[PDB]
Amino acid sequence: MLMITSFANPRVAQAFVDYMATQGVILTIQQHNQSDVWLADESQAERVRAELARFLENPADLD
């Protein structure tokens, strides 16, 4: 199990992880003050962890 980021919103999160998951990159929301977003596809850790910043200024896609 891996921790990636945290989303102000869970939808934001579910959407992302769902998105990531759509990318075949399995994330998930961890019950916390903030929608902590964990990575399941640890193979994607770096990715996901990376994706975020890309996912932030450029979500929706992968590149």
CATH number of the structural domain spanning residue 55: 3.30.70.2350
Bin 24: left if φ > 0, else alpha if -120 < ψ < 50, else beta. Answer: left
Domain that holds residue 11: 1-63
Q: Which amino acid is at 55?
A: F
Q: How many domains does the chain have?
A: 1
What was the elucidation method? NMR
The residue ranges of DSSP E strands in the chain, in sequence order, are 2-7, 27-30, 35-39
Specify the DSSP class assigned to residue 29: E
Q: Which of 47, 48, 46 is nearest to 37 (CA)?
A: 48
Rg of the chain on CA atoms, in Å: 10
